[PDB]
């Protein structure tokens, strides 16, 4: 559950 956003 890391950063899935740009």
């Amino acid at each position, epitope marked *: *559950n*890391a*950063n*899935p*956003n*740009a």
Partner: antibody
Amino acid sequence: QVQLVESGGGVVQPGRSLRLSCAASGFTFSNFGMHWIRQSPGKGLEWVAIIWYDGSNTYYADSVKGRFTISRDNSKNTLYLQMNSLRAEDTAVYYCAKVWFGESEDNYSVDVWGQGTTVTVSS
Amino acid sequence: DIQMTQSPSTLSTSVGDRVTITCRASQSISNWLAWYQQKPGKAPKLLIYKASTLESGVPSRFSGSGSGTEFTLTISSLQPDDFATYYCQQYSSYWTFGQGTKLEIKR
């Protein structure tokens, strides 16, 4: 504002396949990862899958791993979920959801949920 | 597989009451806990993330507290719009939801 429109749900016999879609608007869809989460009266809320904003990383729950495939079309701003080998217990309301914006080292979850589409797996 | 448990399952309450609900995880999830509100026949809505951060647009009468394995959600003064089902969710390792707490109209 943000709007999510699910489609593709319905009644399907066990063992067949089905493709769900989620149309996103009100934000840059290609900049955010998405979740599929299902809800049934027997199991409550149950996370299904997650996909990165660019599709590079995908994760699935153990109960659905190997059967569901999540994908996306950033040119069409459309999220897809191909579900194969459906079982009876997969009957639920399925929501797509948008991951919130946070810091680089924080953990992430969803802030905006879709409208939901009902899937009934029965013979 | 992290087990989640919410208490109480059902709480009979009245408008203006002080409400406190608890949520426990099978293992330590640090502070990575979110609270979501869902009304019947309606989509779920985000209330709190990081166990104590209020989502933008959420009234100040809602507050979160807790860390590790024990978490609480407090409503200082209940309002009729707050009659809904409240779920806690760990997001430290994948995502698992509790059974849900339904706020019932006491009469």
